[PDB]
Design an enzyme around this catalytic site. Structure first.
Site, PDB file in Angstrom:
ATOM      1  N   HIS A  56      41.413  18.146 -26.234  1.00  0.00           N
ATOM      2  CA  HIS A  56      40.425  17.136 -25.874  1.00  0.00           C
ATOM      3  C   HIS A  56      40.344  16.037 -26.928  1.00  0.00           C
ATOM      4  O   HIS A  56      40.782  16.206 -28.071  1.00  0.00           O
ATOM      5  CB  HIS A  56      39.039  17.770 -25.660  1.00  0.00           C
TER       6      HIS A  56
ATOM      7  N   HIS B  35      40.939  10.774 -31.620  1.00  0.00           N
ATOM      8  CA  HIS B  35      42.039  11.661 -31.949  1.00  0.00           C
ATOM      9  C   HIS B  35      41.988  12.915 -31.091  1.00  0.00           C
ATOM     10  O   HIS B  35      40.988  13.204 -30.426  1.00  0.00           O
ATOM     11  CB  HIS B  35      41.926  12.093 -33.417  1.00  0.00           C
TER      12      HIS B  35
END
Length: 216
Positions: free
Chosen positions: A68, A147
């Site tokens: 995720h 990120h």
């Protein structure tokens, strides 16, 4: 009446296929980096403990399932700015919708391994804007922290990955990135010092993800 609590965090959750593709790319990078002469020579700046270091083992704490990209950590409403983030129309309207995220680089530090995400303008609308901002983020564009965590060292928390990315981006901003020190099949390898390494992808990897809330 009792209020509804918020997610632990909001973010983009990659599909099974995209998570597998990114996960494998990350693992291949760890293998290639750890085999690389330039990396082996700097192991002292990587660990203080004295053979070869297998990075896949070094980053022993990894995501169990899908990967995720977090937008806003909410801690169910306890985090500063959580309620304000969740109430936004764009967040409510985007909830459950599919997005494509672009991965531009993979990186490794003594603490974390991750993938840098570069957001579209549509996606930047879901990036939080808070009062208290990191000092390592100053001078960097909104959303620079975005990120995907791929691995953490044993005593490191996953949130560190975003701080590590910001630190790397700060170095690149100052032009301390330096000449590429290697050519991997996916892109140019950069040695940033202090155990920090970045692979700039020749071709950005596109991943499919759903924007939603994780509750733990």
């Amino acid at each position: 009446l009792e209020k509804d609590f918020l997610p632990l965090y909001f973010g983009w959750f990659l599909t099974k296929k995209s998570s597998e593709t990114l996960r494998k790319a990350g693992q291949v990078f760890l293998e290639e980096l750890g085999n690389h002469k330039a990396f082996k020579k700097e192991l002292r700046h990587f660990i203080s403990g004295d053979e070869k270091l297998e990075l896949v083992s070094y980053f022993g704490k990894r995501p169990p399932g899908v990967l995720h990209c977090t937008t806003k950590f909410c801690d169910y409403g306890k985090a500063a700015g959580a309620e304000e983030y969740a109430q936004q129309e764009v967040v409510k309207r985007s909830y459950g919708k599919a997005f494509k995220l672009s991965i531009s680089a993979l990186f490794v530090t003594p603490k974390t391994a991750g993938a840098q995400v570069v957001l579209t303008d549509q996606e930047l609308q879901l990036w939080p804007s808070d009062l208290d901002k990191p000092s390592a983020s100053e001078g960097l564009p909104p959303g620079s922290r975005a990120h995907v965590t791929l691995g953490c060292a044993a005593d490191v928390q996953p949130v560190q990955t975003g701080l590590d990315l910001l630190d790397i981006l700060q170095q690149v901003k100052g032009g301390s990135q330096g000449e590429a020190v290697g050519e991997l099949p996916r892109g140019k390898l950069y040695s940033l010092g202090k155990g920090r390494w970045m692979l700039s992808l020749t071709k950005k990897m596109e991943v499919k993800a759903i924007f939603t809330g994780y509750y733990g």
